[PDB]
Amino acid sequence: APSYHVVRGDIATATEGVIINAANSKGQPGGGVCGALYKKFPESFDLQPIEVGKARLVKGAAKHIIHAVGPNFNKVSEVEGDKQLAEAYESIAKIVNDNNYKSVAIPLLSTGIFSGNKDRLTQSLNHLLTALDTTDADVAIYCRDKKWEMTLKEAVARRE
Numbered sequence: 001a002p003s004y005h006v007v008r009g010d011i012a013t014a015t016e017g018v019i020i021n022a023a024n025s026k027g028q029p030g031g032g033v034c035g036a037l038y039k040k041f042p043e044s045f046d047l048q049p050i051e052v053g054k055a056r057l058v059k060g061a062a063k064h065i066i067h068a069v070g071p072n073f074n075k076v077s078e079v080e081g082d083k084q085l086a087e088a089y090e091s092i093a094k095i096v097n098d099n100n101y102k103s104v105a106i107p108l109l110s111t112g113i114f115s116g117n118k119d120r121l122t123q124s125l126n127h128l129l130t131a132l133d134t135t136d137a138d139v140a141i142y143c144r145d146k147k148w149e150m151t152l153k154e155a156v157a158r159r160e
């Protein structure tokens, strides 16, 4: 194991430049993080349809970016959506192992508006961590606000 750590900043400025997007399974995009990555990595996206909880690793004019399906959690069951939120991180962890991504800038998956329209940060960190229990990659885990920042440590402080 390396380390895993909460970082208050922007993922669309991360040095690793391996980043995740909240794609939907249609490939059709839109978002905060997603529209910040467009201001870093336009010549870097292939926008395909993707399977639910799966990914597409894209190669571009400076870095490689991973599109992944964050399902809208108001459409799925909680125990089922929780199974898909493990799978979405596990199916990413496979790719972070295979393509040898020894450090990565990783966001939250579909935990905000794309949840049940409400914040599930700590449950999404448990699933980020539960996919990473079978990995040896170092983890820049981003946030914007100091309550959300404190929530990502609070989620690690349920597994310390």
Ligand SMILES: Nc1ncnc2c1ncn2[C@@H]1O[C@H](COP(=O)(O)OP(=O)(O)OC[C@H]2O[C@@H](O)[C@H](O)[C@@H]2O)[C@@H](O)[C@H]1O
Pocket (backbone or CB within 6 Å): 009, 010, 011, 012, 021, 022, 030, 031, 032, 033, 034, 035, 036, 107, 108, 112, 113, 114, 142, 143, 144, 145, 148
């Ligand atoms: N640039 C950023 N870098 C890292 N983390 C960020 C960033 N901007 C926002 N976040 C964090 O992610 C959460 C917000 O996610 P989005 O930015 O909205 O993620 P995105 O992939 O773009 O989701 C798109 C969905 O949300 C809305 O932006 C939009 O309506 C769309 O339905 C917050 O908890 C915040 O801490």
